[PDB]
Design an enzyme around this catalytic site. Structure first.
Site, PDB file in Angstrom:
ATOM      1  N   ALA A 260       0.812  -1.214   0.000  1.00  0.00           N
ATOM      2  CA  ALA A 260       0.000   0.000   0.000  1.00  0.00           C
ATOM      3  C   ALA A 260       0.846   1.266   0.000  1.00  0.00           C
ATOM      4  O   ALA A 260       0.625   2.135  -0.829  1.00  0.00           O
ATOM      5  CB  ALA A 260      -0.976  -0.009   1.164  1.00  0.00           C
TER       6      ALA A 260
ATOM      7  N   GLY B  70       3.354  -3.364   6.306  1.00  0.00           N
ATOM      8  CA  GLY B  70       2.749  -2.067   6.561  1.00  0.00           C
ATOM      9  C   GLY B  70       2.502  -1.798   8.027  1.00  0.00           C
ATOM     10  O   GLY B  70       2.721  -0.684   8.503  1.00  0.00           O
TER      11      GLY B  70
ATOM     12  N   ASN C  68      -5.665   4.849  -5.512  1.00  0.00           N
ATOM     13  CA  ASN C  68      -4.395   5.512  -5.288  1.00  0.00           C
ATOM     14  C   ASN C  68      -4.279   6.864  -5.952  1.00  0.00           C
ATOM     15  O   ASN C  68      -3.668   7.758  -5.378  1.00  0.00           O
ATOM     16  CB  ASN C  68      -3.235   4.603  -5.678  1.00  0.00           C
ATOM     17  CG  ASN C  68      -3.172   3.334  -4.855  1.00  0.00           C
ATOM     18  OD1 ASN C  68      -3.800   3.215  -3.793  1.00  0.00           O
ATOM     19  ND2 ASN C  68      -2.429   2.350  -5.339  1.00  0.00           N
TER      20      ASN C  68
ATOM     21  N   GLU D 119       2.756  24.614  10.702  1.00  0.00           N
ATOM     22  CA  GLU D 119       1.955  25.662  11.341  1.00  0.00           C
ATOM     23  C   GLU D 119       0.517  25.155  11.526  1.00  0.00           C
ATOM     24  O   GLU D 119      -0.097  25.413  12.560  1.00  0.00           O
ATOM     25  CB  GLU D 119       1.977  26.950  10.501  1.00  0.00           C
ATOM     26  CG  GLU D 119       1.666  28.211  11.289  1.00  0.00           C
ATOM     27  CD  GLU D 119       1.815  29.481  10.475  1.00  0.00           C
ATOM     28  OE1 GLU D 119       2.970  29.909  10.245  1.00  0.00           O
ATOM     29  OE2 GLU D 119       0.778  30.050  10.065  1.00  0.00           O
TER      30      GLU D 119
HETATM   31  N1  LIG Z   1      -5.475   2.168  -1.152  1.00  0.00           N
HETATM   32  C1  LIG Z   1      -4.697   1.091  -1.263  1.00  0.00           C
HETATM   33  N2  LIG Z   1      -4.774   0.124  -0.352  1.00  0.00           N
HETATM   34  C2  LIG Z   1      -3.907  -0.882  -0.589  1.00  0.00           C
HETATM   35  C3  LIG Z   1      -3.014  -1.013  -1.626  1.00  0.00           C
HETATM   36  N3  LIG Z   1      -2.332  -2.216  -1.533  1.00  0.00           N
HETATM   37  C4  LIG Z   1      -2.819  -2.783  -0.452  1.00  0.00           C
HETATM   38  N4  LIG Z   1      -3.777  -2.022   0.166  1.00  0.00           N
HETATM   39  C5  LIG Z   1      -4.480  -2.294   1.425  1.00  0.00           C
HETATM   40  O1  LIG Z   1      -3.509  -2.527   2.429  1.00  0.00           O
HETATM   41  C6  LIG Z   1      -3.872  -3.680   3.219  1.00  0.00           C
HETATM   42  C7  LIG Z   1      -2.873  -4.791   2.997  1.00  0.00           C
HETATM   43  O2  LIG Z   1      -1.532  -4.319   3.240  1.00  0.00           O
HETATM   44  P1  LIG Z   1      -0.411  -4.525   2.119  1.00  0.00           P
HETATM   45  O3  LIG Z   1       0.206  -3.198   1.892  1.00  0.00           O
HETATM   46  O4  LIG Z   1      -0.985  -5.281   0.981  1.00  0.00           O
HETATM   47  O5  LIG Z   1       0.651  -5.467   2.858  1.00  0.00           O
HETATM   48  P2  LIG Z   1       2.237  -5.401   3.041  1.00  0.00           P
HETATM   49  O6  LIG Z   1       2.604  -4.205   3.831  1.00  0.00           O
HETATM   50  O7  LIG Z   1       2.866  -5.626   1.716  1.00  0.00           O
HETATM   51  O8  LIG Z   1       2.485  -6.697   3.942  1.00  0.00           O
HETATM   52  P3  LIG Z   1       2.750  -8.271   3.714  1.00  0.00           P
HETATM   53  O9  LIG Z   1       2.293  -8.509   2.289  1.00  0.00           O
HETATM   54  O10 LIG Z   1       1.955  -9.067   4.724  1.00  0.00           O
HETATM   55  O11 LIG Z   1       4.249  -8.423   3.881  1.00  0.00           O
HETATM   56  C8  LIG Z   1      -5.319  -3.984   2.839  1.00  0.00           C
HETATM   57  O12 LIG Z   1      -6.224  -3.262   3.673  1.00  0.00           O
HETATM   58  C9  LIG Z   1      -5.376  -3.529   1.378  1.00  0.00           C
HETATM   59  O13 LIG Z   1      -6.690  -3.220   0.925  1.00  0.00           O
HETATM   60  C10 LIG Z   1      -2.938   0.038  -2.589  1.00  0.00           C
HETATM   61  O14 LIG Z   1      -2.193   0.104  -3.560  1.00  0.00           O
HETATM   62  N5  LIG Z   1      -3.833   1.057  -2.322  1.00  0.00           N
END
Ligand SMILES: Nc1nc2c(ncn2[C@@H]2O[C@H](COP(=O)(O)OP(=O)(O)OP(=O)(O)O)[C@@H](O)[C@H]2O)c(=O)[nH]1
Ligand SMILES: Nc1ncnc2c1ncn2[C@@H]1O[C@H](COP(=O)(O)OP(=O)(O)CP(=O)(O)O)[C@@H](O)[C@H]1O
Ligand SMILES: Nc1nc2c(ncn2[C@@H]2O[C@H](COP(=O)(O)OP(=O)(O)O)[C@@H](O)[C@H]2O)c(=O)[nH]1
Ligand SMILES: [Mg+2]
Lengths: 421, 70, 430, 317
Positions: free
Chosen positions: C12, C137, C219, C245
């Site tokens: 994400a 994440g 995104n 600020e």
């Molecule tokens: N808006 C948005 N949400 C995202 C995106 N990719 C994943 N998500 C959200 O993020 C969450 C999953 O986290 P990810 O970022 O896929 O996981 P990661 O940090 O790669 O972690 P691991 O794959 O477990 O190592 C879910 O709630 C998804 O819907 C993206 O490109 N945009």
């Protein structure tokens, strides 16, 4: 890369395993010589199941095991027999006589170390091994006894990896030996402890599907294996193609297994049959129907802890989401309320074969009906110590049978506990 | 007043430095205690598997005894 | 001379980072190769060589996702060392991201970040983008934040956190990861902007007429809101007010650092109609729940701060008139301990859209940052889902198996209970 | 199918409503914290409105309107009357009130109005509620000797007294506002009467229904209940609920709301109706429970979840 080491053991394990490789090899555009002749971008995650060899050949990362050469001689001669690595064929001459003790303790123990040498060799050549997948039956002797032995030894050597199995449960309707409930109970005791996720493929369910609905008077193992390969292709789709949901064995396990022991999945498929044959709302209703389950359990007799649905082919994603929400809500009582959003959905553009299909993977508490059926059959014989001499003659003790029976009864009571929560 | 002006800035330093200190020690303790817990989980797992092998050796031996006393 | 380093963690964070930097490049007239023919305020986000390179670091425990950056249109934009990847991901498990796999890559990340900090004559702080639900994440980010508080003591650390939504959720344990990461990161984050995927999803379906929005759709809309928030740092003017600020006004208490963002207008590129949209129209839209980045009811929540960030053709006269109308007509209730006033900022640079995108190009736009107690609804929803599963200890074995203890779960949940209570207390009259 | 939860066992009204839903065969009652419900009969305080309507596919409805306490709490109602654009200049039916804080704070304005009345020889009796006095010094001291925020309202010194007995009374009306904001006044009201004669000096001091009250009005004043009191009541209810309508409307919310309100009125000797207080969680009269609870089931619940003439829909002109 995220590699899976595939192992197939015994008659059933090698027969369903050979079909699985023929099916996915076709889907990935790999011919029997190991060469690629497909389209799209197949190939993006080909390394999950295939090694890259000299001359741009893709070799299945599969290990073929058996205590008898028979089934092995059948493979190597059939279609996609020459695709496998010759060194990975590991067999004995004295079979297992459908005896778990022989496969687990005596005959199998003599052959196990040489199998592990091949497993180790395949693992050392992995950039990042996710784990292993074993195809086998629980009613025979090699796949059941030696298969569970292999699982135990592999876990000792790779405790931090995922152990996945496709385990064919025995049935009187499709049986070869009266001691199948003994073999199955002994194997389930092992699986409960040493696997992270098991796909319960019930021969009783496969038979009832072929007989009722499919209307096949006398289904053969080939007729049952058609259902298995269609399921195995489906449940492995997210691992073989670029995706977001359950992309690897660990993520699948984390989403599907809320309790370590309760890791027995109930697969589903729709539409039923190919083997010479001819909507999104129709796909959804069928894949959730008791008649489309590969385990002889009524999902309306329990609750779903978790569910993973996979749709294949070109279809409306909006319609898929609407239909999946509709099956839930209309049947919200059959999904545990204490696990929010426990039904996940994936869609793959590449269909199997067919124009569009659906595959259901469910962790239902109704799976206890399968373990109850086996436990009932095991007790009917064990109560009268029927045929115990074949197992005690191999070194085993009656106490081992009492422990396996007890552990399976505990597994049933645990599934019931979460159904009453 | 100059005395208090020096006490303020020194209090800010002593608090930030002490915060940085505690966080460093608590993080190292967490990563260490985690390492111990994960390794213990694997050690018990292997101990269970080893007890299973010891039992298989005892089964193969229990057959060796029955065959000779036949 | 105040530089800002962006850190994008997990899928994400990386995919959102790609969208933000694509937009920033379009806004500053920077080509995908880093060249900027027009050539400063934009140097807060870009270093110079005549190549303009983002002061960003991309981190993921798996190489697919960053590999797309390495081979994509903006491959030349970043320096190879800024794109860091592991081999095995956190499998949607906070414990793997924070402990098992995080420990293995943390030091390398801090070094690559240090290389960016060393090129700064006056580093202002960090902007960390990540999801609450993913294992990287959630897990790796909190480890990173913990280490950054040690290595950079004073420095400010802002977050852009992707709040989980079932419509696009990929894991049943996202509630667990969310509570765990929020708890661990709370003391180490100075300000966090939550982005509810459900809110962005519903805006795309309603305002953009998209039947089933994708991550690319989400995104690009997220990048517009992020751009509005960071515009004050990348541009400068007499009416431009700096984000720090606004941050002084946005965070009354260290723990209450989660502003609600609302953006307007979100118009379809084909259904644009040619309407202009007055300053009064877009300002009013900021108070329509349908335009918020997080699903909640601000009508039933007290305000502690309200900031208006205008972007195109906007003059103060119109803004003041629009605010006057909104007052004595809207449910804008402030806490009795905060002045009932709006802090306004205007950037004369009009909003930019990606060519061939779903968003229509507008003459003026506004992003409102408000600290409302209504955002606590988002915590309540998450904490309830955590409670449902944790009562049965469902999935907990996956965390314990990686070295974690049940104690961390209840400790993180107790902190969330305190946070929900803090939002309750701050709304009570003195 | 339809499922419902009961998170307030003390509510006598919704206990009867729960029984009626269970009697249909269309409704099943789930456990208190089961979030997969269709209808929620929530708690009086700290209802989890933020968690509502977020479970996908489910249609959720709650027996309370988030907010509405701005019309129900004594201090917030005083604030609403004096500050709402719809009420500030038009309100002639709410007694002169000032919010007094003990520990914002219209204490200086109350003393200015009290001094204006004693200089002109006007009635200066006031009632403090979270004491009835004409002194203001002992009224203010009463508030300060309590850790609560009180409201000093002008006491109605000349009420309409019921004969025989010469006794004071107040009217309670039940109003049901469904989803989509349709205001329904329940045909039957109650008069919480006093059983002692009224005194204009003694500051130290039973359910009549609308048929008996209608019969007292002609013969007693030769006027009917309507055109003198019922039109005023309907006007007040309409004005009150519509002033808070934009702040509590669920049209842009993922869930739907409905609420039963208890409007309390007091009639003066010139037959003028005065609003005293609004109740968010009111209690019904024993004989009106069956009809009122059936009306809540039909109008508010069955309109959202589908399986007479007792509720007048209040509309303007
Ligand atoms: N808006 C948005 N949400 C995202 C995106 N990719 C994943 N998500 C959200 O993020 C969450 C999953 O986290 P990810 O970022 O896929 O996981 P990661 O940090 O790669 O972690 P691991 O794959 O477990 O190592 C879910 O709630 C998804 O819907 C993206 O490109 N945009
Ligand atoms: N201004 C007034 N004039 C006459 N009687 C009044 C009055 N205010 C209250 N009362 C009487 O005192 C009782 C007190 O009731 P309660 O304490 O529940 O609140 P209330 O309805 O008086 C609220 P408010 O503060 O809005 O006047 C009323 O039921 C009514 O009989
Ligand atoms: N579905 C299916 N079941 C099989 C197949 N071959 C054997 N079985 C089942 O496997 C069990 C017998 O064990 P088997 O695998 O034949 O022997 P092993 O070599 O001792 O494992 C019985 O329950 C059979 O019904 C097969 O190809 N397909
Ligand atoms: Mg990832």
């Amino acid at each position: 890369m995220r590699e899976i080491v595939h192992i197939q053991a015994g008659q059933c394990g090698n027969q369903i395993g050979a079909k699985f490789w023929e099916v996915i090899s076709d889907e990935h555009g790999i011919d029997p010589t190991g060469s690629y002749h497909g389209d799209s971008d197949q190939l993006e995650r080909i390394n999950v199941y295939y090694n890259e060899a000299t001359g741009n050949k893709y070799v299945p990362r599969a290990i073929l095991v058996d205590l008898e050469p028979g089934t092995m001689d059948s493979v190597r001669s059939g279609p996609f027999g020459q695709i496998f690595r010759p060194d990975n064929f590991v067999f004995g001459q004295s079979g297992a006589g459908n005896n778990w003790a022989k496969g687990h303790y005596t005959e199998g123990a003599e052959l196990v170390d040489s199998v592990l040498d091949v497993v180790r060799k395949e693992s050392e050549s992995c950039d990042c091994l996710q784990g292993f997948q074993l195809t086998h039956s629980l009613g025979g002797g090699t796949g059941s006894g030696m298969g569970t032995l292999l699982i135990s030894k592999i876990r000792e050597e790779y405790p931090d990896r995922i152990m996945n199995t496709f385990s064919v449960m025995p049935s009187p309707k499709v049986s070869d030996t009266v001691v199948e409930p003994y073999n199955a109970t002994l194997s389930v005791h092992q699986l409960v402890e040493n696997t992270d996720e098991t796909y319960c493929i019930d021969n009783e369910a496969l038979y009832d599907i072929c007989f009722r609905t499919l209307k096949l008077t006398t289904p053969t193992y080939g007729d049952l294996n058609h259902l298995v390969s269609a399921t195995m292709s489906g449940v492995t789709t997210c691992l073989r193609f670029p995706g977001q949901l359950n992309a690897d064995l660990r993520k699948l396990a984390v989403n599907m297994v809320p309790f370590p022991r309760l890791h027995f999945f109930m697969p589903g498929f729709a539409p039923l049959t190919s083997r010479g044959s001819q909507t999104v709302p129709e796909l959804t209703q069928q894949m959730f129907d008791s008649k489309n389950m590969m385990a002889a359990c009524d999902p309306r007799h329990g609750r779903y802890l978790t569910v993973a649905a996979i749709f294949r082919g070109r279809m409306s994603m909006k319609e898929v989401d609407e239909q999946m929400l509709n099956v839930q809500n209309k049947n919200s009582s059959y999904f545990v309320e204490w696990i929010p959003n426990n039904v996940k959905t994936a869609v793959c553009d590449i269909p199997p074969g067919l124009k569009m299909s659906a595959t259901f993977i469910g962790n239902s508490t109704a799976i206890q009906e399968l373990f109850k059926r086996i436990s009932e059959q095991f007790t009917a014989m064990f109560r009268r110590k029927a045929f115990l001499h074949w197992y005690t003659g191999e070194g085993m003790d009656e106490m081992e049978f009492t422990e396996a029976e007890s552990n399976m009864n505990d597994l049933v009571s645990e599934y019931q506990q979460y159904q009453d929560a | 007043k100059r005395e208090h002006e020096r006490e303020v800035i020194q209090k800010a330093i002593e608090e930030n430095n002490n915060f940085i200190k505690m966080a460093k020690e608590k993080l190292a303790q967490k990563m260490e205690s985690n390492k111990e817990n994960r390794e213990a989980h694997l050690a018990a797992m292997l101990e269970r598997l080893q007890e299973k092998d010891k039992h298989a050796e005892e089964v193969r031996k229990n057959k060796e005894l029955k065959e000779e006393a036949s | 001379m105040r530089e800002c380093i962006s850190i994008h963690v997990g899928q994400a964070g990386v995919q959102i980072g790609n969208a933000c930097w694509e937009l920033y490049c379009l806004e500053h007239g920077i080509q995908p190769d880093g060249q900027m023919p027009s050539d400063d305020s934009f140097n807060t986000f870009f270093s110079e060589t005549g190549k303009h390179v983002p002061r960003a670091v991309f981190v993921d425990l798996e190489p697919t996702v960053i590999d797309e950056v390495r081979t994509g249109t903006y491959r030349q934009l970043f320096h190879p060392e800024q794109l860091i990847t592991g081999k095995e991901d956190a499998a949607n498990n906070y414990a793997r991201g924070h402990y098992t796999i995080g420990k293995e890559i943390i030091d390398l990340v801090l070094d690559r970040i240090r290389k960016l900090a060393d090129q700064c004559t006056g580093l202002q702080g960090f902007l960390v983008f990540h999801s609450f639900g993913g294992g990287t994440g959630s897990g790796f980010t909190s480890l990173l934040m913990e280490r950054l508080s040690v290595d950079y003591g004073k420095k400010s650390k802002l977050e852009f956190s992707i709040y989980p939504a079932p419509q696009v959720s990929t894991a049943v344990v996202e509630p667990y990861n969310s509570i765990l990461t929020t708890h661990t990161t709370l003391e180490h984050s100075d300000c966090a902007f939550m982005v509810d995927n459900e809110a962005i999803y519903d805006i795309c379906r309603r305002n953009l007429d998209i039947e089933r929005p994708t991550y690319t759709n989400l995104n690009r809309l997220i990048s517009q809101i992020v751009s509005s928030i960071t515009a004050s740092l990348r541009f400068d003017g007499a009416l431009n007010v700096d984000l720090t600020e606004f941050q002084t006004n946005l965070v009354p208490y260290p723990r209450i650092h989660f502003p609600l963002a609302t953006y307007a207008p979100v118009i379809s590129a084909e259904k644009a109609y040619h309407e202009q949209l007055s300053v009064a129209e877009i300002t009013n839209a900021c108070f329509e729940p349908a335009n918020q980045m997080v699903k909640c009811d601000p009508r039933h929540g007290k305000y502690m701060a309200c900031c208006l960030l205008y972007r195109g053709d906007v003059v103060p006269k119109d803004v003041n008139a629009a605010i006057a109308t909104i007052k004595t007509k809207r449910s804008i209730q402030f806490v009795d301990w905060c002045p009932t006033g709006f802090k306004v900022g205007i950037n004369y640079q009009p909003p930019t859209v990606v060519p061939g995108g779903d968003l229509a190009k507008v003459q003026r736009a506004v992003c409102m940052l408000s600290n409302t107690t209504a955002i606590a609804e988002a915590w309540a929803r998450l904490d309830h889902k955590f409670d449902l599963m944790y009562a049965k200890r469902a999935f907990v074995h996956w965390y314990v198996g990686e070295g974690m203890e049940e104690g961390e779960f209840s400790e993180a949940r107790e902190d969330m209970a305190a946070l929900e209570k803090d939002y309750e207390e701050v709304g009570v009259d003195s | 199918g339809y499922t419902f939860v009961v998170r307030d066992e003390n509510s006598s009204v919704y206990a009867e409503v729960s029984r009626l839903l269970l009697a249909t065969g269309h409704w099943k009652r789930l456990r208190r914290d089961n979030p997969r419900f269709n209808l929620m009969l929530g708690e009086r305080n700290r209802l989890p409105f933020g968690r509502l309507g977020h479970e996908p596919g489910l249609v959720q409805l709650v027996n309370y309107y988030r907010g509405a306490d701005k019309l129900c709490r004594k201090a917030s109602l005083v604030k609403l009357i004096k500050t709402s654009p719809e009420l500030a200049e038009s309100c002639t039916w709410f007694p002169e009130s000032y919010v007094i804080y003990p520990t914002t704070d219209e204490r200086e304005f109350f003393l200015a109005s009290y001094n204006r009345k004693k200089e002109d020889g006007e009635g200066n009796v006031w009632i403090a509620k979270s004491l009835i006095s004409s002194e203001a010094s002992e009224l203010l001291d009463f508030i300060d000797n309590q850790g609560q925020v009180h409201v000093i309202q002008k006491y109605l010194e000349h009420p309409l007294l019921l004969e025989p007995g010469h006794r004071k009374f107040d009217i309670r009306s039940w109003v049901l506002v469904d989803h989509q904001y349709n205001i329904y006044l329940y045909r039957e009201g109650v008069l919480r009467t006093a059983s002692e004669p009224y005194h204009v000096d003694n500051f130290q001091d039973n359910e009549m229904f609308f048929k008996e009250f209608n019969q007292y009005l002609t013969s007693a004043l030769n006027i009917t209940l309507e055109s003198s009191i019922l039109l005023q009541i309907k006007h007040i209810i309409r004005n009150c609920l519509l002033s808070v309508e934009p702040a509590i409307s669920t049209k842009h919310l993922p869930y739907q709301s409905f609420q039963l309100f208890g409007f309390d009125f007091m009639v003066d000797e010139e037959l003028k109706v005065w609003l005293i207080e609004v109740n968010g969680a009111p209690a019904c009269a024993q004989k009106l429970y069956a009809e009122l609870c059936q009306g809540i089931v039909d109008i508010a619940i069955s309109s959202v979840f589908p399986p007479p003439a007792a509720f007048i829909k209040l509309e303007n002109l």
